[PDB]
């Protein structure tokens, strides 16, 4: 149960934290249409976070999505390092979104075959949304990569800047492996082929290069984060920290 709880929480945390980053874009996008699109994606991801976190609380036998989101510190958060990266320019945001949506598609496709019914059901809802997200992010990868000289350069740089964090997408620990052998979780190492098939093709189509740097950054799943997470949590949790134990 402890393993299943932690696994579920990781997936919830990935979506929660990325949703937070997308929320910062509200009113700041290059076009009203993009503002609409980012709010929509952030809303889907928030919905997924609520689903995973709710199940995590139910598994643990205490708390709820709000105790989980607002009363854990950065050392207890278990999101991927990729989703806590700063928004940066629009290409930095597109790169991060594309890497994640490609992964979500690969993951949720297989997780809807989980032998855990609730995880399977949550995943069956999330995959429909992840497919929308991937069309949007891949569409923008192509438009920026194969746009102007300027946009092509920014998109390459965005990709290069984020690459080292992709290692964690296929990192497996004992929780992953144990649950995967029970047919409950997906072993993230087995997601590489599908993610690379999508992402390599997408970058190529955009007229860009796959970075040659070997990806090496992990630790988010173990509560070992970059220096970006603490400040995100200060902002996210402030009100709950000031006025704890209330209804809103």
């Amino acid at each position: 149960s402890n393993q299943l709880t932690a696994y579920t929480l990781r997936l919830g945390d990935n979506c929660l934290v990325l949703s937070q980053r997308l929320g910062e874009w509200c009113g700041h996008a290059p076009e009203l249409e993009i503002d609409l699109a980012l709010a929509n994606i952030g809303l889907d991801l928030l919905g997924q976070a609520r689903n995973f976190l709710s199940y995590a609380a139910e598994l643990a036998g205490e708390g709820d999505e709000d105790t989980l989101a607002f009363t854990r510190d950065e050392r207890q958060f278990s999101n991927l390092l990729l989703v806590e990266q700063p928004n940066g320019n629009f290409a930095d945001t597109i790169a991060r979104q594309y890497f994640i949506d490609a992964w979500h598609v690969a993951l949720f496709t297989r997780l809807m075959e989980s032998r855990d019914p609730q995880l399977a059901a949550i995943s069956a809802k999330a995959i429909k949304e992840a497919r929308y997200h991937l069309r949007f992010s891949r569409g923008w990868l192509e438009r920026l990569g194969n746009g102007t000289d300027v946009s092509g350069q920014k998109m390459q740089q965005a990709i290069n800047k984020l690459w080292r964090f992709t290692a964690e997408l296929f990192d497996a620990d004992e929780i992953d492996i144990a649950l995967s052998e029970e047919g409950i979780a997906v072993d993230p190492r087995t997601l590489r082929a599908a993610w690379e098939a999508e992402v390599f093709a997408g970058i190529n189509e955009a007229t860009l290069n796959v970075p040659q740097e070997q990806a090496y950054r992990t630790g988010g799943k173990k509560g070992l984060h970059t220096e970006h997470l603490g400040p995100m949590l200060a902002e996210m949790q402030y009100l709950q920290r000031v006025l704890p134990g209330q209804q809103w």
Binding site: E24, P30, D66, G147, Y238, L239
Partner: protein, 304 residues
């Protein structure tokens, strides 16, 4: 003597025949609607900013999700209004630029800061409540594309306004600190919400023509009075007060009589000198300028 075109138009208006984009219309009618629908669409856009200010800080995931859905809808409503304005022969890109330059207005209410989470529920409740009274009144505006866009918009907005009230109800029934938060947000937003309806009927240069052309179906003062009569019972339901020493029920007239609006403040705000005017326009100018390479990328990709 009116021309036959002019006379026919007045007859169409009198018989409540909706004006469509291909119909003749007085040039002053075309222009006042480009003005009003364009600034209505500008308001949707700017209004994302005070609410967006709290998306990352909302106290629960439920309230955060509700707020994201609202803001996403506001964006969609801006799009509907730009489409409607474009049927009159204007260009979205052009009127948006006039907004950036301070050559066109957006709603006064969006120049006020969100200083607490209660401000968000109060915007959902009072501010959206005022926009609903005004916007439902425009479902019978004489220009068809505008009327039909109001119908669609009003169907969506009133749901969000109900959610705003429920967020305020949670504070009203919560701890003493939450109740004080709500009251303080009301104290700061009450009069600015009243100002959303526009200047008094004595000080409203566009009303003469707008009323005659059935663009405006109720006077600024009429709509504001209805809002006060409808909203005061909602304030009471929350166990809250109104920052107005002169507010009282007048059994003689069957209305709540309320105090004088600060028109000096109103005029400061609509002319760029309110609390957040500079910040709101800086933010949209920054988004436009920094997004330029993105728009140029999309254009260059389309052509290939």
């Amino acid at each position: 003597m009116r021309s036959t075109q002019e006379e026919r138009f007045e007859q169409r208006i009198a018989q409540e025949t909706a004006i469509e984009p291909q119909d003749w219309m007085p040039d002053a009618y075309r222009k006042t609607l480009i003005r009003q629908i364009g600034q209505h669409a500008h308001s949707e856009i700017v209004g994302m900013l005070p609410e967006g200010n709290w998306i990352t800080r909302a106290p629960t995931l439920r309230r955060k999700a509700i707020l994201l859905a609202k803001v996403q809808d506001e964006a969609g409503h801006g799009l509907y209004l730009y489409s409607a304005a474009e049927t009159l022969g204007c260009a979205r890109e052009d009127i948006y630029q006039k907004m950036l330059d301070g050559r066109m207005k957006y709603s006064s209410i969006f120049n006020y800061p969100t200083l607490s989470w209660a401000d968000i529920g109060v915007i959902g409740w009072l501010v959206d409540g005022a926009a609903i009274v005004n916007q439902v009144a425009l479902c019978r505006t004489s220009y068809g594309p505008y009327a039909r866009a109001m119908v669609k918009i009003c169907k969506e907005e009133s749901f969000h306004q109900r959610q705003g009230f429920e967020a305020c109800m949670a504070l009203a029934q919560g701890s003493e600190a939450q109740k004080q938060m709500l009251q303080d947000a009301i104290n700061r937003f009450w009069w600015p919400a009243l100002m959303m309806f526009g200047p008094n009927d004595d000080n409203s240069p566009n009303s003469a023509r707008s009323l005659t052309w059935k663009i405006k179906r109720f006077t600024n003062d009429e709509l504001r009075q209805r809002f006060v009569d409808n909203t005061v019972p909602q304030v009471e339901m929350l166990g809250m007060t109104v920052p107005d020493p002169d507010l009282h029920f007048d059994t003689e007239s069957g209305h709540y009589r309320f105090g004088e609006i600060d028109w000096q403040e109103f005029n400061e705000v609509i002319n760029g000198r309110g609390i957040c005017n500079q910040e709101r326009l800086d933010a949209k100018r920054k988004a436009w300028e920094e997004g330029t390479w993105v728009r140029e990328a999309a254009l260059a990709h389309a052509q290939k």
